[PDB]
UniProtKB/TrEMBL annotation, chains A, B:
Coiled coil: none annotated. NAD(+) binds at G8, A9, G10, L11, M12, G13, D30, E72, K77, S97, N121, K252. This is L-gulonate 3-dehydrogenase. GO terms for biological process: fatty acid metabolic process. It comes from Archaeoglobus fulgidus (strain ATCC 49558 / DSM 4304 / JCM 9628 / NBRC 100126 / VC-16). Belongs to the 3-hydroxyacyl-CoA dehydrogenase family. One of its GO terms (cellular component) is cytoplasm. Residues 165-260 form the 3-hydroxyacyl-CoA dehydrogenase C-terminal domain. The record marks H118 as: Important for catalytic activity. SUPFAM superfamilies: 6-phosphogluconate dehydrogenase C-terminal domain-like, NAD(P)-binding Rossmann-fold domains. It comes from the Archaea.
Length: 282, 282
């Protein structure tokens, strides 16, 4: 059982404190006592015995990890982090939506133990947490924070410099924007996800899904699309071509991006049928 | 109850025949009797009373709609479609993965009643079907095929020239390829979908999800990312800026891309918790 200092009693700070208090003690700090009171009344009653609410920083030196979730502004984050870094040598973790971790890190005195920890909303519900490292972050700090988050029951992905989730959301939104400008209804953009792509990417991911499509199929299909249209997004990737030269063409060969057993196709359909039934889309 | 002619007794043709035979009579044609025999033994026994297997085209003139699912090659598709167009004035529907519907249509004698119908795999399980229209396709042909598919229980999206699903898959795969080349493990690319983005896009779609993020939040966040990094995918869309000028900033304003009632945030969390529990990711 560790003690975690959480800076900022807004929605995200409050949620992080709830997620952590399941297993650890928390100190939740905010300069506003009104924010602390509002937070307290939103926290499950059983967890209140594990959370100290405060306006000051004296408990920072007693904590094993600091999580910062203040306003999304470079100078504000730098200011709070520079204050806390003098009080402790613990890992310092900014919940940063889009502010660059490298831009923050380069303004700290001791950036080797600073990194980004990107929680999803609500932090205590959603399983994914991304660790976003700067060029300064050391390996020990990553492994410590990764272990902490994993032991909390989170699914952890470590990213360099930028969030992978933000990257994928922007790539999808950029394409959706093209469709919107072309005249595609928003509802239809969403329906191709809600009734198809979201299901496949949920169960298999986009790369796992590719194995079932067939890596050979995908390379020649994307290549045709590139030669026909020829949007950059269709351009056939180099990593894919090494796979096809190896005969690692997917589920049909028992190996593509991943390795498969004989019942893979049958299991795919079983899992999709189950998800469709659950969602009421059967 | 209509009669539908399906050309090609491979996996996709066989699956389309199974999907349709739930409600309609089917003639399933292939030049190979061995393919027809293999198809017959994969078709549910209760449906066999609704499906005629044949090697010839005499029943095409009796059918209300023709679905073509032959080898993915322009000249092969054109050849079969040119043959069938002489025998009937019914809508002609090519299950085309990536071959351009416009390239096919321009080689037909009567392209006003030709369109693409893109079934997912397996056709009889997966609810989404895309209609992909050429510059020639008339509105009557679309509405007829859309109605047929809807009444079959499919979720139909009508697309101009290219599949929206193919577009989104290529956009996501292009970004994943960048990540792969950078050193991101495939498993991690997939985990950000399987444990997060796939769930959000399944339940809300990428645009509906944006409403909860906040359209104002997204515009300024993407704008920062564009000014900082500045990948084209971060470039802030024009449609978004009109929304923010209108105060249609999302769920918080009761209106963004879509319109919302007071319990929207609470209902979002309830639906995500239910899906997490079902998937065993809670
Ligand atoms: Cl203090
Ligand atoms: Cl004939």
């Amino acid at each position: 059982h560790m003690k975690v200092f959480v800076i900022g009693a807004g929605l995200m700070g409050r949620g992080i404190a709830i997620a952590i208090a399941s297993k650890h003690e928390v100190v939740l700090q905010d300069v506003s006592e009104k924010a602390l009171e509002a937070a307290r009344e939103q926290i499950p009653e059983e967890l209140l015995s594990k959370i100290e609410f405060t306006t000051t920083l004296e408990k920072v030196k007693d904590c094993d990890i600091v999580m910062e979730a203040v306003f999304e502004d470079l100078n504000t984050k730098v200011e709070v982090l520079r204050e806390v870094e003098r009080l402790t040598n613990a890992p310092l973790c900014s919940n940063t939506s889009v502010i660059s971790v490298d831009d923050i890190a380069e303004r700290l005195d001791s950036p080797s133990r600073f990194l980004g920890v990107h929680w999803m909303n609500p932090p205590h519900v959603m399983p994914l947490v991304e660790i976003v490292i700067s060029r300064f972050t050391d390996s020990k700090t990553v492994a410590f924070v990764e272990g902490f988050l994993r032991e909390l029951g989170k699914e952890v992905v470590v990213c360099k410099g930028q969030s992978l989730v933000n990257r994928f959301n922007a790539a999808v939104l950029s394409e959706a924007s093209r469709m919107i400008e072309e005249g595609v209804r928003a509802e239809d953009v969403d329906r191709v996800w809600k009734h198809h792509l979201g299901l496949l990417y949920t169960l298999f991911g986009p790369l796992g899904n590719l194995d079932y499509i067939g890596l050979d199929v995908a390379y020649y299909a994307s290549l045709y699309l590139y030669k026909r249209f020829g949007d950059e997004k269709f351009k056939p990737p180099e990593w894919l071509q090494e796979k096809i030269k190896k005969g690692e063409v997917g589920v049909k060969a028992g190996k593509g991006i991943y390795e498969y057993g004989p019942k893979a196709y049958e299991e795919r359909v079983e899992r999709l049928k189950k998800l469709l039934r659950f969602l009421g889309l059967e």
